[PDB]
């Protein structure tokens, strides 16, 4: 589970789509000096995961507030593919995550 953390990144793309027949949302975190950090949270099939809706709303707020976020993605065994988002943090408004 090669997890990673990215602080003081901005949400640039937000998208709710369908992967085959499973719900799926993704965001692209971007920082000027670099590449795009894409992570997706997929509807694990198990209907109970309020997680999906909660993280989705939280990610929408982060997108809405235009705040720098600090995000933790795990990794996908095939490059050029968004990894799974496991935690999201909204940095102090108007500032930076320390």
């Amino acid at each position: 589970l090669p997890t990673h953390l990215y602080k003081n990144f901005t949400v640039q793309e937000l998208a709710l789509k369908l992967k085959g027949k499973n719900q799926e949302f993704c965001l692209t975190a971007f920082m000027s000096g670099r590449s795009l950090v894409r992570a997706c949270l997929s509807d694990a099939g198990h209907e109970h995961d309020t997680w999906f809706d909660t993280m989705l709303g939280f990610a929408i707020s982060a997108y809405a507030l235009k705040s720098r976020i600090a995000l933790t993605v795990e990794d996908s065994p095939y490059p050029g593919t968004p990894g799974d988002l496991l935690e999201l943090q909204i940095c102090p408004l108007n500032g930076y995550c320390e």
């Binding site: 309020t50 997680w51 909660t54 496991l86 943090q89 408004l93 995550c97």
Partner: protein, 110 residues
């Protein structure tokens, strides 16, 4: 853990975070960093990690979760009852938040 309930005052929620509850998958942890307004950039109360559990089986948003949202967007000064329990947020431990009333003034919030 902490031996007893602390009670910070004039605190402001500065950052918020959602994380999977390390243990029970039916719950998650809403964590944040509280700061005593005006304190020394270095005093202990100038950076206070906290977390509270959210039950993923119950739809909606808990009263804490709703206030937590308002007071963050608005930066309102609060009285927080922290501890005893200690959850783990961002590597370091963090005190469980069990209550939190907005400050009216110098009266309830010194």
């Amino acid at each position: 853990d902490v031996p007893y309930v602390l009670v910070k005052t004039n605190m402001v929620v500065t950052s918020v975070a959602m994380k999977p509850y390390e243990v029970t998958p039916t719950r998650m942890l809403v964590c944040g960093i509280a700061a005593k307004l005006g304190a020394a950039a270095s005093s202990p109360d100038a950076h206070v990690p906290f977390c509270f559990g959210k039950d993923l089986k119950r739809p909606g948003s808990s009263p804490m979760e709703v206030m937590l949202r308002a007071v963050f967007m608005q930066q309102r000064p609060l009285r927080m009852f922290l501890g005893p329990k200690q959850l783990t947020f961002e590597g370091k431990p963090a005190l469980e938040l069990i209550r939190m009333v907005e400050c009216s003034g110098k009266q309830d919030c010194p």
